[model samples]
Target: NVAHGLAWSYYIGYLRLILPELQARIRTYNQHAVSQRLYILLPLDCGVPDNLSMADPNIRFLDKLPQQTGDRAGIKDRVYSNSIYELLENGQRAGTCVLEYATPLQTLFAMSQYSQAGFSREDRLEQAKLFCRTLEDILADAPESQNNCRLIAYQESFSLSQEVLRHLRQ
Candidate 1:
């Protein structure tokens, strides 16, 4: 059951690492009032090719993106738990980012709840690219340190989720 608690534990640890950056980003832009909820999409598979060692420190997979949590009143609390495994096959674990809106942006790109009927591979990759670019622009003018981890935003594919689970169960 290596993958059973892997993602959850990884996510929790990641939160700790980025919490401070997240707090600073929110306050830096005075977005504490309007930037309601933040949704993070982290990769379960380490972005390294042929590497299974999660303890590797040089894994700079999302090193240029902001990893932060948002806290605001009147914000809806929703946690959409999904996993993306196939996307990590190419050593491209640089897929991490937070959506500005609370509404599941992944859904808009074609990911449906409990089903992968409308999932579009093209849409998912594009979304990741867009998120990364947006982060680059935000960091360009900011005075804070630019040494943040980067990530791609991905909508969980039902098939992909099942695959990850199956691998874990084995």
Candidate 2:
């Protein structure tokens, strides 16, 4: 299953404030990219106390998931075993928990291209639009929810290719 982890607070707020239709669209239309979009837009170091040995090959699903290590941190032991493990404490695991390390962006791009084996160009365009629009809104309201958001540009970095954008517009 595709998991969408966010800092618990932000995740709750996003679920509450955004329109239900938009949320559904995000889940059904862009499950692949939604995880990456969350990471890029709401980047945060959750600082989970990691004795956990969790890993994420899929990072795109949720926002701020706390990782819990099954291991105990004895005296002089580090808080986390690894960066990925830190993420695991919060109950965020990549798809199937086997392909552990995936950023939301990576998942989005991959799914956009591969989810439907024979997805048509028209479908791709529609998906791209939804991705961009959703990303834009999240960035717009990012500042209010996250303190570290000040570090991010919040401005969009890339736009659709001319040919694609044109085709989409039409």
Candidate 3:
């Protein structure tokens, strides 16, 4: 059912690519332990069509995104979506999807602007390092085959994350 809804080509590419990679990495670790960490809510859209009308959020175990209906998702979200989508798409996954999207994702490594305004470099870098560390931890737990990705979530706003965490707890 999740795969049968309204479709966006680029969003599809994300589903085909990065989600798989994250899923593979997570699955290697097995079912997540709720007490070990706060559920990692990605701040991006679910990539599902906005009209699908869910009374609640769809929380997937993957570690990625593709934004849906949100005010700020216009430019940076657009670029970030395409960036990582492509980064993961071409960098590894999609080469097999018989699927697709494209990008450098350089800023993530170069410590350049995260394409956001008002955030300081040291702050962003530290947070970025933390994310990488989390990724490392996930990888440390498992291998290269199984995946935990299921649905792409809509979490572009802070409140959405709160909503997701709330939905997840119950």
Give the whole-model CA lDDT for all candidates, comma-separated.
0.34, 0.29, 0.29
Steric clash count of candidate 2: 30
Tell me the tens digit of each residue's lDDT in model 2 across 1-170: 12122222233444233322233333543443322122222112211212212212213223322322322335442231112111222344312111121134334344546747454434433444344445446545754334211112112233212212222223
RMSD of 3: 18.7
For residues 92-161, write the lDDT of model 1, one tens digit per residue: 4432223322122333333422344554444544444444444445435544314332333334313332
Give residue 5's error in model 2 in angstroms: 13
10 residues in a row with least lDDT, candidate 3: 95-104
Q: Relative to the unseen true structure, what is the Cα RMSD of model 1?
A: 15.4
TM-score of 3: 0.23
Per-model TM-score versus the true fold:
0.26, 0.24, 0.23
Cα shift from native, residue 3, model 1 (Å): 28
Where model 3 places Cα greater than 4 Å from the true spot, the runs are 1-7, 27-158
Quality of model 1 by C-alpha lDDT = 0.34
How many residue-pair clashes does candidate 1 contain? 10
Q: Write the per-residue lDDT of candidate 3 for residues 23-56, one digit (tens) a residue.
A: 3333443453211111222222112232211322
In candidate 3, the residue pairs with backbone N, CA or C atoms under 3 Å apart (3 or more residues apart, or in different chains) clash, namely 23-147, 23-148, 44-155, 45-67, 45-154, 46-153, 46-154, 86-102
Best by TM-score: 1
